[PDB]
Design a protein around this ligand. Structure first.
Ligand SMILES: Nc1ncnc2c1ncn2[C@@H]1O[C@H](COP(=O)(O)OP(=O)(O)OP(=O)(O)O)[C@@H](O)[C@H]1O
Ligand SMILES: Nc1ncnc2c1ncn2[C@@H]1O[C@H](COP(=O)(O)OP(=O)(O)OP(=O)(O)O)[C@@H](O)[C@H]1O
Ligand SMILES: [Mg+2]
Ligand SMILES: [Mg+2]
Ligand SMILES: [Mg+2]
Lengths: 500, 494
């Protein structure tokens, strides 16, 4: 049943940003302090650190003290990438505003926001992936098919990091930031790699939400595209009963760190059946079946991820696997984050004959993730053209302002925008949107896919309706405030030459 | 021939901005100076004051020293409005940048950009409309049909002005800024109200460009929509040979000033036939026929201006004509600029029992046109919600960055953007686009309507093909790396 596969699927990304405030040679502020500084306008306006912005994404201050951006629901991959990048734009704006406000205060520093998973001590913050799935779908299958792919997935989509041991694993370049910590998390008693149990944010009967913590945060758009897209393909294959060999492993986290250490992909995993496979082999099988699936795969009637796009995903996936087996990364050194980072690091090492333990390298490892244009290394690389682009800048810029038209987020956006224009208080959630005053009116959006709801239309109408003398009064006063007090001189002074 | 009418038509807008730099109680800078300052970043990059921006619009410094923004070719009315509005954003950005740069210099002032047609002295700068037309289309017909409409059009779409006599005409609110000056232009020995002779910027055999100088610059989107849309409907009716009556005027500019003075539309125009009609009557006839035409008018197969939108325009037009007849403007006071302006002025007068000669009122007259958000009167009014919107903010914001997808402009945009990323020099015009180096390659786009050209793709391909780092990065990085890394510490979330 090829039709069963969800070609049009709701997906979202949760991004936790590393945050610091530094004068040269020191940190001016505590992370919690600078975080509070950044959210200061938001808290002033809405009286909450946690809010939903007009594009439909959720922006909030984490328990970890991290600024967190959760994308609006997206049914298309390029779309998802656009909004994830949009988060970077918004967050950076917030950072700059914090800098200026502190500067007025005589406090001098630069804000650094990192889209990365680790710190010098070895604490970890993650990028989280959310995929809509049918209620019917079983856990066992997920463990049988999805999990081996996810464990090995770090080879193709990894961001990379340098690992420094404290007085086990030696010093080396690692393809994945998250692997060690995910392992720590599962081993210590305790967060799952995969969870289908948490609230769907969709109608309970129809759907579940699949939560993935394994992935790295990615700077390069192709890396994101590969990471999410491959997962989508695997999910599609599982749904369609396309068949995939069951690769279930005796222990999921057994080889994960080791895989992280080995670029070759030669690491050996023990399957439940008692067979043994290299990680690269696992990737190879999944990829091959995906390749057949694409030919099998029917185009979505509405929206979704096009077969062309999936072809692109498979192209990159293939080139990357090819690179790992071959050992020649020249084809992909623009697309994949760990490869890119490694290339640059290699440049520094060669120029200085530097050791891996060299601080400059660690600095590069961190700053690559810095999201400020013209400061962060990734940005520099993009300016040179060393980085490949999946999507245009302008689409991202559109994404910061407006909600995805295809998904439910669109509706949310409308309300928010209307509210902001009207000046009426509103309370919004993924599923639930309501108008607080004068009389509370609540609409629940069960369907993530639907971009059209009648009740929402009535809600906005209500808001507009409730939206004489006081208005004009305040207005006249405001205009007086705006206008220069000596009017006569202002108008007299204005002089111009005739044009054309 | 209803099919013959051009439902999808290329339209451009030429906007000249009033510019001044003022400290309180004085003008800090000469307009040429502040203009040069605003355009200084552009000149450094491109070595030219005149350039084409990625959205496909032309941005340049006028001989008058006015910054001028000319919209990219648009085949849709709302589209046109979007890009025109986008021009305000771009221009204001340039202005603020200038303010900051002067501020660093110890020179303190505020930049003002006015989208209006006049100054206190009485010099005039215009908003110009460009409409694509067939070469076949006769001038004579335009004189008989289009011109009477244009003269009277100021009533419906006018921006408004206060007129002050110099020690002729008395003091009063005027619906239109441009009328007196246009009258001076035709009367004095000589710029025409409409010209089809200037270069089409399209294939000469197929098309001509019609240029209209009569209009006011408009702040409110519905006002723009009404002006351009009404003009479009008239053009469509003429093209279709719908049979709109010819009301030819003995002298085009004879009553125009007078028309500007009278809100009732009771001003009487002498026709060539010797019949006499009031301006309101002219507008009424044209409007009624346009209304019939919409019933007749076929939907454009691709793009263009939809019949629904034209219905919107006619609704506004009808409400305006009725308001003028009745004297009750309550219905349209959100939509039309001169009505809005008059309303605000009325509030001020009511509050202060002010005379019309009062400077504050003139100040309101000028500042209403100021394009800076939150300082502009129009901006304030809109924020309160007192102003009607034809288009969304977001569409405008998109328009600032990217070219119209439907028209030729799109192609141009594709080229420019590419160059900017690639860093290859390019030379661009409305029709003509070329790559200067290594070997010059030129593509000429004859068709304004076409958004797809293979030659353009080849050009971009060429650019792509033909198209230090460590030092830069070292510059960016904090010099003490170990301390920088050591310092970074975070708590794990979730
Ligand atoms: N129906 C759905 N299917 C799949 N993903 C969804 C759906 N609805 C929302 N999402 C995605 O789920 C993510 C929600 O993460 P969010 O941070 O809001 O919740 P959470 O962190 O799981 O909850 P908490 O705040 O309690 O930790 C968003 O990225 C959103 O795009
Ligand atoms: N084929 C066309 N049909 C109608 N209008 C067009 C066409 N091509 C371009 N336009 C519009 O004509 C306007 C041209 O403005 P521009 O400033 O270039 O004037 P110009 O004719 O070059 O005169 P000048 O150089 O003196 O300003 C633009 O707004 C553009 O949108
Ligand atoms: Mg979350
Ligand atoms: Mg011009
Ligand atoms: Mg001109």
């Amino acid at each position: 049943t090829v039709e069963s596969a969800l070609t049009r699927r709701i997906m979202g990304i949760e991004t936790e940003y590393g945050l610091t405030f530094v004068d040269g040679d020191s940190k001016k502020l505590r992370p919690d302090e600078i975080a509070r500084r950044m959210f200061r306008p938001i808290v002033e306006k809405y009286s909450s650190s946690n809010i939903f912005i007009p594009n439909g994404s959720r922006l909030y201050l984490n328990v970890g003290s991290h600024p967190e951006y959760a994308t609006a629901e997206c049914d298309n991959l390029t779309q998802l990438i656009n909004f994830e990048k949009a988060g970077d734009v918004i967050a950076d704006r917030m950072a700059v505003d914090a800098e200026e406000s502190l500067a007025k205060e005589d406090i001098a520093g630069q804000v650094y926001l990192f889209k990365n998973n680790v710190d010098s001590v070895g604490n970890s913050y993650g990028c989280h992936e959310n995929y809509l799935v049918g209620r019917s779908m079983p856990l066992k299958a997920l463990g049988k098919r999805l999990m081996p792919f996810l464990i090995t997935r770090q080879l193709i989509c990894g961001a990379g990091r340098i690992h420094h041991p404290n007085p086990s694993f030696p010093l080396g370049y690692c393809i994945s930031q998250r692997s060690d910590h995910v392992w720590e998390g599962v081993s210590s008693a305790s967060r799952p790699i995969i969870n289908t149990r948490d609230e769907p944010h969709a109608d309970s009967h129809s759907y579940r939400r699949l939560h993935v913590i394994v992935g790295d945060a990615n700077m390069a758009e192709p890396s994101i595209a590969l990471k999410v897209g491959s997962t989508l393909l695997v999910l599609e294959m599982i749904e369609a009963d396309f068949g995939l060999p069951s690769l279930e492993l005796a222990n999921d986290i057994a080889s994960i760190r080791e895989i992280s250490r080995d670029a070759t992909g030669s690491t050996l995993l023990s399957l439940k059946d008692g067979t043994t496979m290299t990680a690269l082999q696992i990737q190879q099988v999944v990829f091959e079946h995906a390749s057949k699936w694409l030919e099998q795969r029917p185009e979505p009637e509405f929206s979704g991820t096009s077969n062309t796009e999936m072809a692109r995903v498979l192209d990159l996936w293939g080139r990357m696997l090819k690179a790992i087996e071959s050992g020649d990364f020249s084809e992909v050194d623009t697309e994949i984050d760990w490869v890119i980072k490694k290339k640059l690091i290699d440049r520094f090492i060669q120029r200085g004959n530097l050791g891996l333990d060299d601080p400059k390298l660690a600095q590069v490892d961190l700053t690559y993730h810095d999201i400020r244009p013209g400061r962060g290394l990734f940005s520099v690389l993009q300016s040179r053209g060393m980085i490949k682009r999946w999507t245009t800048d302008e689409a991202i810029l559109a994404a910061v302002d407006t909600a995805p038209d295809t998904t439910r987020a669109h509706l949310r956006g409308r309300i928010l925008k209307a509210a902001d224009t009207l000046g009426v208080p509103v309370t919004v959630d993924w599923m639930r949107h309501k108008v607080n005053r004068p009389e509370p009116q609540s609409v629940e959006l069960g369907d993530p896919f639907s971009a059209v709801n009648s009740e929402v239309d009535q809600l906005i109408e209500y808001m507009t309706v409730h939206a004489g003398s006081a208005s004009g009064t305040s207005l006249l006063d405001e205009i007086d405030g705006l206008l220069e007090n000596n009017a006569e001189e202002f108008v007299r002074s204005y002089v111009q030459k005739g044009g054309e």
